[PDB]
């Protein structure tokens, strides 16, 4: 049996997401104290971001950049920091260096996007730009997503030190020397890493259709797809449960998120 048409049932949420407050801020944070922000309960248009000519790096990893307007996401974040030119290639899984080992480390099962642009005309002073720093010495490596704002004195020698600076005891931070005539490669690039996880609240702007039953069509209830015959259901969901599975471990009963009702999925 062949399907007939498609059905989409997203929630009834209308407002837009605070993406201007992450991308268009007046000045970001330095990389050793990277900023972080939760995004929830909003409608996220990723098309308007992807189809700008501004971004000179856009590498989504678990999800492809084209089909971002269709899925639904849980635990969206957004992380803003400032790094050099030849260090954008380290914001990735399984890279090694100084930005990826002492400052900001991405895990291996990563599912997000990595955006960058060139901001030489916004972050660079004619003297010395002493207000973006990065950690240079640390004893060990980092976890995934672990910050370390601690300006305690380091010890590279066998002899101990104290709160003084001397021979073989160093101050752990360091500044970039951003300069409006640095070559392309030492200029300030400006990074935002999105990360999400695949009970959802924030997702894309697909216009909601209306429910048809009792025949073989397509269906999309909160990013979950398939084809099947949406009957009327008898299952008794306690009000925190939404999906529903059998021993064959496929989706067979779904709550319609617009009008709260339990439906069954019998395969065509």
């Amino acid at each position: 049996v062949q399907p007939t048409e498609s059905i989409v049932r997203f929630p009834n949420i209308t407002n837009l997401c605070p993406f201007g407050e992450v991308f268009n801020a007046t000045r970001f944070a330095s990389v050793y104290a990277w900023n972080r922000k939760r995004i929830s309960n909003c409608v996220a248009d990723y098309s308007v971001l992807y189809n700008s000519a501004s971004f000179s790096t856009f590498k989504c990893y678990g999800v492809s950049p084209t089909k971002l307007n269709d899925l639904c996401f849980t635990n969206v974040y957004a992380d803003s920091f400032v790094i050099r030119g030849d260090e954008v290639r380290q914001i990735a899984p399984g890279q090694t260096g100084k930005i990826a080992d002492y400052n900001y480390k991405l895990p291996d099962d990563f599912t997000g996007c990595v955006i960058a642009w060139n901001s030489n005309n916004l972050d660079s002073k004619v003297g010395g730009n002493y207000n973006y720093l990065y950690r240079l010495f640390r004893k060990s490596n980092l976890k995934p997503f672990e910050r370390d704002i601690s300006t305690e004195i380091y010890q590279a020698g066998s002899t101990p030190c104290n709160g003084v600076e001397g021979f073989n005891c160093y101050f752990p931070l360091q500044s970039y020397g951003f300069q409006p005539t640095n070559g392309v490669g030492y200029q300030p690039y400006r990074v935002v890493v999105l990360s999400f996880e695949l009970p959802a609240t924030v997702c894309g702007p697909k216009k909601s259709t209306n429910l048809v039953k009792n025949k073989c069509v397509n269906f999309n209830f909160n990013g979950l797809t398939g084809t099947g015959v949406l009957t009327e259901s008898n299952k008794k969901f306690l009000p925190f449960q939404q999906f529903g599975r059998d021993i064959a471990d496929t989706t067979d009963a779904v709550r319609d998120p617009q009008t709260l009702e339990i439906l069954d999925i019998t395969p065509c």
Partner: antibody
Amino acid sequence: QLLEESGGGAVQPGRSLRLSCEASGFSFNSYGMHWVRQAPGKGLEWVAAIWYSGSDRDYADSVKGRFSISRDNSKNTLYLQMNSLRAEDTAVYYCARDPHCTGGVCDAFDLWGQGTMVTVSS
Amino acid sequence: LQMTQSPSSLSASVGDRVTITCRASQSISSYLNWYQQKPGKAPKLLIYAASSLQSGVPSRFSGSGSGTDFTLTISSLQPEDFATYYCQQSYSTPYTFGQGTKLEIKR
């Protein structure tokens, strides 16, 4: 948290004085530190600055080659060493702190100090 | 660099708008800070990076502009807002201040 300045009040022309600034209640070594003066009834004016490395520092157009700023991250103090004073180096001197970018304020010195009058006359 | 601040004198009544102008002499960026000095005490920070309010300052003050033209604007005065207003550039060393706009009470 506050920034208190000690330091002298009266010298002859052509001598030396050594000011101080004793910060208390925050992390001293993670900020930059500046000196700003004020001739009596006139506008503000920028004098010196010292940063993280201990060998990077700046001075004005006039006083460069006469003053010498240095810090000491253990006693939480900031020093200024004036040498060969002129007539018109008389003012009230302030110490101020400018943070570095972690999301909040950046390079606008926000916390200030008391002020110690310096009189240079015969 | 050489920053030029005007008007030098001002007199307003309680409940008006005031426009202070501080033009630079070569272009910088969003690097400009605004200070307030009540006579006798230390100065105090209001607007940093040419447009952002500093936490503690009310949302009555608001500055704007970039490039070479910068402007501070109070919406409707209070009796506690009468001082001298300074504008500072953060771009090149030395950091030069302005001249000041002394803000008076009218009767």
